[PDB]
């Protein structure tokens, strides 16, 4: 699945993950640590919406 950051437009793709910030490819959005934030704008997970 893909989620968009409502603040800046960054797309979190579960297939790509966010390796530079400790999230390997395949990690579901729900499993990402609660302290992880948008790598572009710093928005918390609450500001993402599932596409
Ligand atoms: Fe963002």
How many angstroms is it from 26 CA to the middle of ligand 1? 20
Cβ-proximal residues to 7 (8 Å cutoff; 6+ apart), any chain: 38, 41, 43, 47
Sign for the CA dihedral angle at 36, 33, 16, 20 comes to: positive
Method for this entry: neutron
Rounded to whole angstroms, the Cα distance separating 9 from 36 reads: 17
User: Residues within the annotated binding site for Fe cation?
Assistant: 5, 8, 38, 41
Collect residues with CB below 5 Å from ion ligand 1.
Answer: 5, 7-8, 10, 38, 40-41, 43
**Binding-site residues from annotation:** 5, 8, 38, 41
For residues 36 and 46, is the Cβ–Cβ distance under 8 A?
no
What would the CATH number be for the domain defined by 1-51?
2.20.28.10
Name the region of 18 (left: φ>0; alpha: ψ -120 to 50; beta: rest). beta
Resolution of the PDB structure in angstroms: 1.6
Residue with tokens 């790509």: 16
49 forms beta bridges with 4
CA 36 to chain centre: 8
- Please report the sign of the dihedral spanned by the C-alpha atoms of residue 25, residue 36, residue 12, residue 27: positive
């Amino acid at each position: 699945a893909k989620y968009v950051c409502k603040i800046c437009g960054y797309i979190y793709d579960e297939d790509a993950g966010d390796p530079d910030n400790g999230v390997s490819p395949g990690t579901k959005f729900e499993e990402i640590p609660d302290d992880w934030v948008c790598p572009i704008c710093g928005a918390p997970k609450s500001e993402f919406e599932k596409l």
